[PDB]
Structure 1
Amino acid sequence: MIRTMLQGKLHRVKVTHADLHYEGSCAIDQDFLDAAGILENEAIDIWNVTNGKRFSTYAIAAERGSRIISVNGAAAHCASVGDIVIIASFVTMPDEEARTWRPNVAYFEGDNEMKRTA
């Protein structure tokens, strides 16, 4: 049988300003995507720690080094600039692989400064 496992997550990133509208997606600095193992166009779950909302959308890449986290445009109702969120992707795999699977986790503080641990 096939398990659904946390692939990776961006832990407590902050939603930022962004000039562009992102058409229902969440735009995410490519560096952050790299660290969490998240792909452009991948389904993602976003858990808003500030307001408690939980929603699902898809990831798009923002410019590397922009530190952008944006639901600007069509997804603006579920998060606001300043809100602290967790962004997760989930993958499927056989049970044996699942049993020793290690998610790709990136932790954030401050001005979306990324760390390997908390």
Structure 2
Amino acid sequence: MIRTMLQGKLARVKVTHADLHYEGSCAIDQDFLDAAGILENEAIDIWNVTNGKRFSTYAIAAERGSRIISVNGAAAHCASVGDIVIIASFVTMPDEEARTWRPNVAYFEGDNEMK
């Protein structure tokens, strides 16, 4: 059987930009994508700690070192600047491999400072 497993997550990042008129996606500092193994154009779930909303979109890269988390397009109705969110991606694989699978998790505090 094939399992769906957490690939990676960015835990408790803060939204830095949110505009309806910008591209419909979530733009993320490439350093953050690197740490969590999340890819350009990959499906992601965003879970909003501040307002409780949960939604799925896809990731794109923002400039390395910018510490940007930009929720744009329709998704701007689901998060505001300052909101604390968790961004996750999932992969599938057979059960035998899933049993020892290790996700890529990065934790954040303050102004999107990775700890």
TM-score range, shorter chain: over 0.9
Deviation at 1:41, TM superposition (A): 0.2
Determine what percentage of the aligned residue pairs are the same residue: 99
Deviation at 1:44, TM superposition (A): 0.1
* CA distances 1:40-85 after superposition (whole Å, capped 9, x unpaired): 0000000000000000000000000010001134321010000000
Cα distance change, pair 65–21 in 1 and its aligned pair in 2 (3 A)? farther
TM-score (norm 2): 0.94
Cα distance change, pair 19–78 in 1 and its aligned pair in 2 (3 A)? closer
Cα distance change, pair 20–35 in 1 and its aligned pair in 2 (3 A)? farther
Measure, in 2, the Cα distance between the counterparts of 1:47 and 1:61.
Answer: 19
Kindly tell me the number of residue pairs found equivalent between the two proteins: 115
Deviation at 1:25, TM superposition (A): 0.2
Q: What do you get for the CA RMSD once the two structures are aligned?
A: 1.6
* CA distances 1:75-98 after superposition (whole Å, capped 9, x unpaired): 210100000000000000010110
5+ residue gaps in structure 1?
none
Measure, in 2, the Cα distance between the counterparts of 1:67 and 1:108.
Answer: 11
Is contact 2:18–2:79 with CA below 8 Å preserved after alignment?
Answer: no
Is contact 2:18–2:81 with CA below 8 Å preserved after alignment?
Answer: no
SS of equivalent to 2:77 = coil
Is contact 1:18–1:68 with CA below 8 Å preserved after alignment?
Answer: no
Measure, in 1, the Cα distance between the counterparts of 2:84 and 2:18.
Answer: 16
Cα distance change, pair 83–25 in 1 and its aligned pair in 2 (3 A)? same
Is contact 1:15–1:85 with CA below 8 Å preserved after alignment?
Answer: yes
Is contact 2:41–2:60 with CA below 8 Å preserved after alignment?
Answer: yes
Range moving further from structure 2, 56-65 or 17-26: 17-26
SS of equivalent to 1:66 = coil
Measure, in 2, the Cα distance between the counterparts of 1:85 and 1:25.
Answer: 15
Structure-1 residue corresponding to 2:80? 80
